[PDB]
Amino acid sequence: MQNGDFQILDYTGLISTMPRVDTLLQSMNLFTEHFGRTTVARIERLDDGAGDIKAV
Amino acid sequence: MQNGDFQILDYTGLISTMPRVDTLLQSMNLFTEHFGRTTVARIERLDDGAGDIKAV
Structure with a gap:
């Protein structure tokens, strides 16, 4: 590596830094992946239960 | 060994000590070594990051 016009110097190394990602x-793998075709999706719900019986 | 000019002495060996080092x-080997040619050394640093992509 070149120093001033009439002098030289020794190059040593490179230092690099980057923020953590x-x-x-x-890692926890809590999301399931679906590969569709369109840009619109449908979800179906079906909720059921029961009641109480009164005397007659 | 002789004493004065006519008597004798018992010799009890040598005693020596040295300071701490x-x-x-x-020992931990923390440092590295680089051997070059000149008296002036250069270093280079590179900083890189990322961007927050938005939706369009």
Whole structure:
């Protein structure tokens, strides 16, 4: 590596830094992946239960 | 050994001591070594990150 016009110098190394990227949620694997075709999706719900019987 | 000029003495060997020499820091092998040619050294640093992609 070149120093001033009439002098030289020795290059040593490179230092690099980058912010951390988190992957905890990815690791936990709580999300299921679906590969569709369109840009619209449907979800179906069906809720059921029961009541109480009165004397007659 | 003789004493004065006509008597004798018993010799009890040598006694020697030396001061401390601490190598705890050196032993850990923390530092690295680089050998070059000139008297002036350069270093280079590179910083990189990421961006917050939005929806369009």
